[PDB]
mmCIF file with all atom_site columns, C-alpha atoms and ligand atoms in Angstrom:
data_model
loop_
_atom_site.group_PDB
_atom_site.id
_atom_site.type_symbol
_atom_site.label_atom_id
_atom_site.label_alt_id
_atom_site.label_comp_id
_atom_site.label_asym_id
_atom_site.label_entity_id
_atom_site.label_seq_id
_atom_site.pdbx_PDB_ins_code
_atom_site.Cartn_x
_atom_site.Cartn_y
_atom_site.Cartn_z
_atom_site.occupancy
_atom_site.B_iso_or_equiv
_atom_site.pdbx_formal_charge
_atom_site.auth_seq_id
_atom_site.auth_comp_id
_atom_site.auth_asym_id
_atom_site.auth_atom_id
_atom_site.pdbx_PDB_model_num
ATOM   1   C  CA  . UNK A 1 1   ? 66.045 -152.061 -20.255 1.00 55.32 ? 1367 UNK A CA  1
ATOM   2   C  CA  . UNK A 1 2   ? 62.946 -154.508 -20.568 1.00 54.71 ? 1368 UNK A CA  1
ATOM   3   C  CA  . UNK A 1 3   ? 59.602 -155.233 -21.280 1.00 56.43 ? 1369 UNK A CA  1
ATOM   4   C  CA  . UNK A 1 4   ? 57.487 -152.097 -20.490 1.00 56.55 ? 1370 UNK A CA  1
ATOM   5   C  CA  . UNK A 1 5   ? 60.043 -149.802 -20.360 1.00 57.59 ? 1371 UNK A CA  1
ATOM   6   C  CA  . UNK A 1 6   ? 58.073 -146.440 -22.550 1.00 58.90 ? 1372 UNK A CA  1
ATOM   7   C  CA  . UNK A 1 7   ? 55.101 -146.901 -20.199 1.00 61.54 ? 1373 UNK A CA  1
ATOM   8   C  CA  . UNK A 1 8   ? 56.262 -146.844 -17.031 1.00 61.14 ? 1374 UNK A CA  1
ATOM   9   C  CA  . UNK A 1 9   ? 55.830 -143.453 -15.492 1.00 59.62 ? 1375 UNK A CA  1
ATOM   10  C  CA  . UNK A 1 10  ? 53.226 -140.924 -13.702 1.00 60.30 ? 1376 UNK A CA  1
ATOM   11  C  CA  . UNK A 1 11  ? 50.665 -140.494 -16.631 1.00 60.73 ? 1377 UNK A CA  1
ATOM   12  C  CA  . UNK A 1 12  ? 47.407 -137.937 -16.728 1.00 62.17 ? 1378 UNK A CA  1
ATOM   13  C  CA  . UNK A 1 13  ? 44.023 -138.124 -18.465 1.00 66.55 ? 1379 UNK A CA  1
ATOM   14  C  CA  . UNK A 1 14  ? 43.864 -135.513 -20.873 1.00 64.44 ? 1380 UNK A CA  1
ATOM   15  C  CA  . UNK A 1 15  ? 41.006 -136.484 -23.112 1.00 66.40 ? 1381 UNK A CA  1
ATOM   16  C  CA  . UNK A 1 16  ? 37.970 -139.498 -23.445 1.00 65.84 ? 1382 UNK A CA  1
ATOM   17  C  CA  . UNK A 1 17  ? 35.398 -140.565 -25.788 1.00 69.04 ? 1383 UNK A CA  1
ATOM   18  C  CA  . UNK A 1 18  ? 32.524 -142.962 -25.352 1.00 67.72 ? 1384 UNK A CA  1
ATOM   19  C  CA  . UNK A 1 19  ? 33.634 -143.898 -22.147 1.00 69.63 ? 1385 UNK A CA  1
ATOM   20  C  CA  . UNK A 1 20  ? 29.656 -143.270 -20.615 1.00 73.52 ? 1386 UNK A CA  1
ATOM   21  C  CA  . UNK A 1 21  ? 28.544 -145.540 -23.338 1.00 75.70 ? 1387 UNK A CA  1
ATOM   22  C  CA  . UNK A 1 22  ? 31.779 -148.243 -22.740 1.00 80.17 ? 1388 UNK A CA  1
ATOM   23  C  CA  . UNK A 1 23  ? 30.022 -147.785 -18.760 1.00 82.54 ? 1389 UNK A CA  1
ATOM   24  C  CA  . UNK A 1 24  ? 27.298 -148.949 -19.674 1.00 81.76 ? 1390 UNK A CA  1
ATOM   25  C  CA  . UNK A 1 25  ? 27.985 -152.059 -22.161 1.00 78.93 ? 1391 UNK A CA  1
ATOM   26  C  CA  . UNK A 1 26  ? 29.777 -152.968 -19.052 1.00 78.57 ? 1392 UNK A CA  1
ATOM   27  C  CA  . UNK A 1 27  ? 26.778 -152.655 -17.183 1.00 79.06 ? 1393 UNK A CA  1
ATOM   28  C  CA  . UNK A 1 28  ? 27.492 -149.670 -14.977 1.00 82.87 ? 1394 UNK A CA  1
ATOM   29  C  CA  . UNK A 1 29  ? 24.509 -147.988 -13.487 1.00 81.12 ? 1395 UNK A CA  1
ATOM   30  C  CA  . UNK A 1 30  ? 23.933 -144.685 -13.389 1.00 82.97 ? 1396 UNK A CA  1
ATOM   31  C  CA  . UNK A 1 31  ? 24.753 -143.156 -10.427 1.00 83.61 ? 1397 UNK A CA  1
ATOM   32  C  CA  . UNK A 1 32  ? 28.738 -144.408 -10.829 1.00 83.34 ? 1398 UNK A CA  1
ATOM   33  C  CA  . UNK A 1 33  ? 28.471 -143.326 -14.272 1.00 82.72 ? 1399 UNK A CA  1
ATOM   34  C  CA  . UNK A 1 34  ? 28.218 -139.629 -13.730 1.00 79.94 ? 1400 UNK A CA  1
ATOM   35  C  CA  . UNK A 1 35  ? 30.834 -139.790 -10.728 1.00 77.61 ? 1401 UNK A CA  1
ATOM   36  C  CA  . UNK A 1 36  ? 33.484 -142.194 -12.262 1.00 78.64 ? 1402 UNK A CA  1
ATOM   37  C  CA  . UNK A 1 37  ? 32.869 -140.485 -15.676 1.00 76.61 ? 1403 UNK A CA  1
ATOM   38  C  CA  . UNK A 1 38  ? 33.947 -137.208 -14.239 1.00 79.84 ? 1404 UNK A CA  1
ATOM   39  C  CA  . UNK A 1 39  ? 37.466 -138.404 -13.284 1.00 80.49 ? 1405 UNK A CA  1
ATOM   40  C  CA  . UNK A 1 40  ? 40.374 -137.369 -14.472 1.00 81.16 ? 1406 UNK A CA  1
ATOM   41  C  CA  . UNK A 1 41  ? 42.820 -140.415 -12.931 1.00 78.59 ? 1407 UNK A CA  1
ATOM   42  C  CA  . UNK A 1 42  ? 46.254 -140.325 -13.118 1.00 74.84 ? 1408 UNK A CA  1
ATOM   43  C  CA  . UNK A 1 43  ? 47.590 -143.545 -14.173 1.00 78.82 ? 1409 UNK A CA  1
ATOM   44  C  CA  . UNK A 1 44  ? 50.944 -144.615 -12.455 1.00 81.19 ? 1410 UNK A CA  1
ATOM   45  C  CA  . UNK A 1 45  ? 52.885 -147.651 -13.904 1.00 79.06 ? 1411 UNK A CA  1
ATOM   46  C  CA  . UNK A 1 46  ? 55.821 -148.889 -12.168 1.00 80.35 ? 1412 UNK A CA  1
ATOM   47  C  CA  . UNK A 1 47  ? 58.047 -152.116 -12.885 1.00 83.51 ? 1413 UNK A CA  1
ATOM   48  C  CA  . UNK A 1 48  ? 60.111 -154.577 -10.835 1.00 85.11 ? 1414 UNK A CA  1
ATOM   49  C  CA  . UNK A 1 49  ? 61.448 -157.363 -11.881 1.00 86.06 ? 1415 UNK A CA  1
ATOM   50  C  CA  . UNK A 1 50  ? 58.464 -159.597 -13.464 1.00 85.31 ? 1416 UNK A CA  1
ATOM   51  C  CA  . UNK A 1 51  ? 55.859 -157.691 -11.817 1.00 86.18 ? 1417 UNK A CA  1
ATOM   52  C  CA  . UNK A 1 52  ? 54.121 -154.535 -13.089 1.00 87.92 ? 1418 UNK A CA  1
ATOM   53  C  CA  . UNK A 1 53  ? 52.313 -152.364 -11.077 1.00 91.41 ? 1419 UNK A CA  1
ATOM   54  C  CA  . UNK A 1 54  ? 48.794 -150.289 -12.604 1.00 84.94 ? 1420 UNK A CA  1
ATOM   55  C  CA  . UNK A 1 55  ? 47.927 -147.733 -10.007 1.00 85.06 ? 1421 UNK A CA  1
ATOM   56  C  CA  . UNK A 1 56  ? 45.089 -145.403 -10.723 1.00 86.61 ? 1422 UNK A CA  1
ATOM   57  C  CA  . UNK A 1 57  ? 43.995 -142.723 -8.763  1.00 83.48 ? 1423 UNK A CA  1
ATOM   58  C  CA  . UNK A 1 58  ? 41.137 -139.930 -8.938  1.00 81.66 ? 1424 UNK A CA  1
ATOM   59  C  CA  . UNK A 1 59  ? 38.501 -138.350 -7.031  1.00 80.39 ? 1425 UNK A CA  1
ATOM   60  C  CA  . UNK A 1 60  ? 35.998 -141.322 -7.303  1.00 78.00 ? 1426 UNK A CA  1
ATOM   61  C  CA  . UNK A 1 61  ? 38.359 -143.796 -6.749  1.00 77.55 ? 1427 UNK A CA  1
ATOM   62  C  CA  . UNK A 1 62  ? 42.197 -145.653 -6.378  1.00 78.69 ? 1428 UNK A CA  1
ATOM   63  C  CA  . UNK A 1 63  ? 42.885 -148.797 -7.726  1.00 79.05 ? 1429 UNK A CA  1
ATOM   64  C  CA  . UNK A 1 64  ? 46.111 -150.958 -7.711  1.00 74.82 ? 1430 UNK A CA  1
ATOM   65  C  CA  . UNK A 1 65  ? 46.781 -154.111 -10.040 1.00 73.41 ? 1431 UNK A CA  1
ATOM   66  C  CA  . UNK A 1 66  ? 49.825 -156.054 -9.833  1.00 71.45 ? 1432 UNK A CA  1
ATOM   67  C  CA  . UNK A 1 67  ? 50.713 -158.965 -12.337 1.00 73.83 ? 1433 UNK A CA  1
ATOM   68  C  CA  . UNK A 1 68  ? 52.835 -161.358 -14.488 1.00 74.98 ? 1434 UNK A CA  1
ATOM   69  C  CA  . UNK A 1 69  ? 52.870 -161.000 -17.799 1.00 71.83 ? 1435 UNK A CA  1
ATOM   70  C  CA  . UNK A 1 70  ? 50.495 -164.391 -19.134 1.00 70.82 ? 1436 UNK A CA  1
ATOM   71  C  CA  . UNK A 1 71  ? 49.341 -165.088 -15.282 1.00 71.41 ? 1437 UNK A CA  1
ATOM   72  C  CA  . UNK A 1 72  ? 45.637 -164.705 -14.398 1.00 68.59 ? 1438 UNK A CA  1
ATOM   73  C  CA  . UNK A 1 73  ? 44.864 -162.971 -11.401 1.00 66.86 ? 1439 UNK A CA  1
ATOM   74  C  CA  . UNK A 1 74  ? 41.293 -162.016 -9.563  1.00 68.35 ? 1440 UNK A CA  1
ATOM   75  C  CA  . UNK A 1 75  ? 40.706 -158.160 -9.817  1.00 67.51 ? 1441 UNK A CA  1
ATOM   76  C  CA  . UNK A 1 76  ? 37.513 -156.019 -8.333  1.00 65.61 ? 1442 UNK A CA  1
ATOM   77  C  CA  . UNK A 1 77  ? 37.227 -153.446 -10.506 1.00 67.69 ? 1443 UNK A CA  1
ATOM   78  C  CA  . UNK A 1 78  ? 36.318 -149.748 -10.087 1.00 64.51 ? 1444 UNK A CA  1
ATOM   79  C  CA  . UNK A 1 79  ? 32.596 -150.512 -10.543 1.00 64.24 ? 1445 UNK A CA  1
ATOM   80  C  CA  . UNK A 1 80  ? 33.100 -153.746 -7.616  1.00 62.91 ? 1446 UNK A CA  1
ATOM   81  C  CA  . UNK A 1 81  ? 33.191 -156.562 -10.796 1.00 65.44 ? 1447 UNK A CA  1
ATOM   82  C  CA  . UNK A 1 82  ? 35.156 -159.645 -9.934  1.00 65.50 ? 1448 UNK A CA  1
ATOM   83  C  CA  . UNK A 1 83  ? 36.887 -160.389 -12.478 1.00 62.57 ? 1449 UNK A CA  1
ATOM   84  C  CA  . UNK A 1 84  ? 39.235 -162.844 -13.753 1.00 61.29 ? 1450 UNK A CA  1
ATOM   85  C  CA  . UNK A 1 85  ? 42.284 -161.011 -15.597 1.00 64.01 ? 1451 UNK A CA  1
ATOM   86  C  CA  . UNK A 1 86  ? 44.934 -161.739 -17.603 1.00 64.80 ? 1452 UNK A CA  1
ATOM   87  C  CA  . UNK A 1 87  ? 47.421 -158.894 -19.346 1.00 63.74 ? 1453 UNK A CA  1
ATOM   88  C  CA  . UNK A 1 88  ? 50.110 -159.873 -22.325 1.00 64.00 ? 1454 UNK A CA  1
ATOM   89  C  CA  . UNK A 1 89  ? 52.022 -157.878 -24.499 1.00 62.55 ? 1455 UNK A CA  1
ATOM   90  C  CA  . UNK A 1 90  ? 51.128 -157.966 -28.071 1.00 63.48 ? 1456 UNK A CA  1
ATOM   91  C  CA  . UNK A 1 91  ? 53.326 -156.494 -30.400 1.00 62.19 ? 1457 UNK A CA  1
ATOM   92  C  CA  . UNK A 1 92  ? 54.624 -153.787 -27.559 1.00 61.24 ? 1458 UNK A CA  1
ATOM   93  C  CA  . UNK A 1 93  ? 50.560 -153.392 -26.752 1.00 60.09 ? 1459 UNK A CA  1
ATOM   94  C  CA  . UNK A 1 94  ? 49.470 -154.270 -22.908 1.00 63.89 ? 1460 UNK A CA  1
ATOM   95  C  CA  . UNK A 1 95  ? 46.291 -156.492 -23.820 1.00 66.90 ? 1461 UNK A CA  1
ATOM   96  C  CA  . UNK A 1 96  ? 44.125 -156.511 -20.470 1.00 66.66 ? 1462 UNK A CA  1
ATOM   97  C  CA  . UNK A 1 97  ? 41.284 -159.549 -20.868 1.00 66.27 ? 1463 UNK A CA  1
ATOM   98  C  CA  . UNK A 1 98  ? 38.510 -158.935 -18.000 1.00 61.65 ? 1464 UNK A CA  1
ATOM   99  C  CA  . UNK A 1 99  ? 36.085 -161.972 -17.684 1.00 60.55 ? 1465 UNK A CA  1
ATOM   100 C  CA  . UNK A 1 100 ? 33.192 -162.111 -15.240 1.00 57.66 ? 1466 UNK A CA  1
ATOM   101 C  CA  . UNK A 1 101 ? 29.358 -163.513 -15.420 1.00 57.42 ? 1467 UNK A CA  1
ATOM   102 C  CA  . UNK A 1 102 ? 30.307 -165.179 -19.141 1.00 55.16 ? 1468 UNK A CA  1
ATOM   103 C  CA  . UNK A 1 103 ? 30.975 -161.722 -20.029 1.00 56.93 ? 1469 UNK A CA  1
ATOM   104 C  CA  . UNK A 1 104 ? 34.399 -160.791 -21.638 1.00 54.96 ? 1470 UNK A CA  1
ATOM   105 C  CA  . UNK A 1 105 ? 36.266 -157.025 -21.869 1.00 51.70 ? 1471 UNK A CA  1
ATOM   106 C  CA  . UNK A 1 106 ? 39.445 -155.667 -23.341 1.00 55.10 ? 1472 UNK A CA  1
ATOM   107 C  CA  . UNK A 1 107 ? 41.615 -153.195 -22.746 1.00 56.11 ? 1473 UNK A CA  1
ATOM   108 C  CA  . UNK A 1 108 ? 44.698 -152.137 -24.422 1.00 55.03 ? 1474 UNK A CA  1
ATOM   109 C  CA  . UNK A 1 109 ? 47.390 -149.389 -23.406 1.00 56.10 ? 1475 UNK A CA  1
ATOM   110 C  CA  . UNK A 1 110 ? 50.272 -148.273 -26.288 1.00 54.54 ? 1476 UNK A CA  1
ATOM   111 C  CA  . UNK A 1 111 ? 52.244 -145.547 -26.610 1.00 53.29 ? 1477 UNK A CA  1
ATOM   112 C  CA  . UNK A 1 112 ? 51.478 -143.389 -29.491 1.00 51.50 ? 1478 UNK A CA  1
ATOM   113 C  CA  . UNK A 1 113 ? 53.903 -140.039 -30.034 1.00 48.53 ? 1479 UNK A CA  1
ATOM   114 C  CA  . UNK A 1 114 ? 54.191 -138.339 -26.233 1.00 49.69 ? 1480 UNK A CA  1
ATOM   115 C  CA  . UNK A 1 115 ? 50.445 -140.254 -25.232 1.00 53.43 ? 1481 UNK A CA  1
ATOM   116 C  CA  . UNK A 1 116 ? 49.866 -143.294 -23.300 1.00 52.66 ? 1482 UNK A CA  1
ATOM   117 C  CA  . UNK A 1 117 ? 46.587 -144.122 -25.745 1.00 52.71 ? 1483 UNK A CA  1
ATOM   118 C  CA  . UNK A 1 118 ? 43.851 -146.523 -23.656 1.00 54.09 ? 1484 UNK A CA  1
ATOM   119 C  CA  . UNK A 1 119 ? 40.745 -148.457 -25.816 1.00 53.67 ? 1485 UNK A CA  1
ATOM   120 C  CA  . UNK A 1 120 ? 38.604 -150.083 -24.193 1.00 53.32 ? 1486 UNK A CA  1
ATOM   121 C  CA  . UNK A 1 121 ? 36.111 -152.373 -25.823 1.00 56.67 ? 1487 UNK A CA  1
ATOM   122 C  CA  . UNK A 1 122 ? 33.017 -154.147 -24.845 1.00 56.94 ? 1488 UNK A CA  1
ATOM   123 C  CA  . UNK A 1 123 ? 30.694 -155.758 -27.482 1.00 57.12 ? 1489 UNK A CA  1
ATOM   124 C  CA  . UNK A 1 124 ? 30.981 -152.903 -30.073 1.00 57.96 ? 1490 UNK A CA  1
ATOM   125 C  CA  . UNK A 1 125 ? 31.510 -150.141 -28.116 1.00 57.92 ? 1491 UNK A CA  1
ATOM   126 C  CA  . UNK A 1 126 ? 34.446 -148.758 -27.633 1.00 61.14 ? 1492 UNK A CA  1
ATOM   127 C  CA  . UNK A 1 127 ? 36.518 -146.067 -26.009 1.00 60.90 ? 1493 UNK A CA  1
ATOM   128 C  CA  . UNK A 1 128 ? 39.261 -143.995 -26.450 1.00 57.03 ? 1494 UNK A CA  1
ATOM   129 C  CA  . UNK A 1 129 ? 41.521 -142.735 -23.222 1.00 55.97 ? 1495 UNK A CA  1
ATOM   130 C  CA  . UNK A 1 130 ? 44.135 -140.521 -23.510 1.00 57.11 ? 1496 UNK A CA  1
ATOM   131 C  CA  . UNK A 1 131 ? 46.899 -139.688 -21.239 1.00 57.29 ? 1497 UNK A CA  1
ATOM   132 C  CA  . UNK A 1 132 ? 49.662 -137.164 -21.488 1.00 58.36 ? 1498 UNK A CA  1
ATOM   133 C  CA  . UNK A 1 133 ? 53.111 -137.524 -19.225 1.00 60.14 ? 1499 UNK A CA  1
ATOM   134 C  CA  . UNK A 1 134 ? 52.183 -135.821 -15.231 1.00 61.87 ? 1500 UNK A CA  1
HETATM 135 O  O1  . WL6 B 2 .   ? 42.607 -145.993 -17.428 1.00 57.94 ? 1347 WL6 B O1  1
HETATM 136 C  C1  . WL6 B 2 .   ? 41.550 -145.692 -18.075 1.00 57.94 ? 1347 WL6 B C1  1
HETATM 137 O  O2  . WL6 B 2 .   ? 41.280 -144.496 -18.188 1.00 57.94 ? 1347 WL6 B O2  1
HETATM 138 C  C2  . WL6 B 2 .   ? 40.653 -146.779 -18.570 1.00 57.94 ? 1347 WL6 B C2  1
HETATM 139 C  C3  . WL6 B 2 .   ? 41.179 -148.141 -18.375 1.00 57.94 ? 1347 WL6 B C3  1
HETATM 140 C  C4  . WL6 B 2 .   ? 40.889 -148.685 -16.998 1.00 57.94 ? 1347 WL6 B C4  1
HETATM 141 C  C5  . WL6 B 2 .   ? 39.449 -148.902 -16.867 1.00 57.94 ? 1347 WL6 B C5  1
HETATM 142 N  N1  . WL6 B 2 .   ? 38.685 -148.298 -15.972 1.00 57.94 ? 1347 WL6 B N1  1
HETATM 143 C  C6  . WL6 B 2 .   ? 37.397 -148.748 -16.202 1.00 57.94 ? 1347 WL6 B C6  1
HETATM 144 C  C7  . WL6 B 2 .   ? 36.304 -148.348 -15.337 1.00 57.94 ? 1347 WL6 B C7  1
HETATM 145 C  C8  . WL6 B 2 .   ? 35.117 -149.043 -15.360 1.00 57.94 ? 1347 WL6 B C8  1
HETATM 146 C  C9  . WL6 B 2 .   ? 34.080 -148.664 -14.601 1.00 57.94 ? 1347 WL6 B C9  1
HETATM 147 C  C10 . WL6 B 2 .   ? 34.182 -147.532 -13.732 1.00 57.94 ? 1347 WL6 B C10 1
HETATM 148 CL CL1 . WL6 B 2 .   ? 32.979 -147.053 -12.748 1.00 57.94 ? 1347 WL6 B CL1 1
HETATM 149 C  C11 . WL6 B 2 .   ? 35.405 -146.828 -13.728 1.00 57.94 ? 1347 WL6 B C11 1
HETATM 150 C  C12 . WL6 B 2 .   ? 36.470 -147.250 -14.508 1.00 57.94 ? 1347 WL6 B C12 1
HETATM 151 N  N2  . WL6 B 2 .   ? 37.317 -149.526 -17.241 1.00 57.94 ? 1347 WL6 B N2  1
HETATM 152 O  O3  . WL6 B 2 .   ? 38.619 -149.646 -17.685 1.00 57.94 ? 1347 WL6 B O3  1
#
């Protein structure tokens, strides 16, 4: 047993908040605000070895990160940022750092009861993700 062990699995949104305004801190524009902020991904989190696998998939798009725990790697994001990432565990807390353009945005994934709870933060905004077991 390891490292990520109560997140791996097949996950599914079941709730957000803010995540339109969290869109747009991260300078989003409209258009891929109203599609992407109709998802509902399901999250899929896999582990082998050192490397952990962040699939998500939805309607608007599918996504795939793999990664080292402490070891940058480039990432295009949903909205087509480049970004430089890096993701640690803090205190059994995925910490995801995004920075692109001198710009800088976090997002953390925990387990909380039966939910895989998601915040993600930009300046002051932040939202709230939830996902239930698929
Ligand atoms: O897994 C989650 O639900 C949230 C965490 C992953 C994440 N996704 C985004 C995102 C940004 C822009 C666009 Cl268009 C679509 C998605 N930001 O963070």
């Amino acid at each position: 047993s390891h490292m990520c062990d109560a997140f791996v699995g097949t996950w599914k949104l079941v709730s957000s908040e803010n995540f339109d305004d969290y869109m747009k801190e991260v300078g989003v524009g409209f258009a891929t605000r109203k599609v992407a902020g109709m998802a509902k991904p399901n999250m899929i989190i896999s582990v082998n070895g050192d490397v952990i696998t962040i699939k998500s998939e939805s309607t608007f798009k599918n996504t795939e990160i793999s990664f080292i725990l402490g070891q940058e790697f480039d990432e295009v994001t949903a909205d087509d940022r480049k970004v430089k990432s890096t993701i640690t565990l803090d205190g059994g807390v995925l910490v995801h750092v995004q920075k692109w353009d001198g710009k800088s945005t976090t997002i953390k994934r925990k387990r909380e009861d039966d939910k895989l709870v998601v915040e993600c933060v930009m300046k002051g905004v932040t939202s709230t993700r939830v996902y239930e077991r698929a």
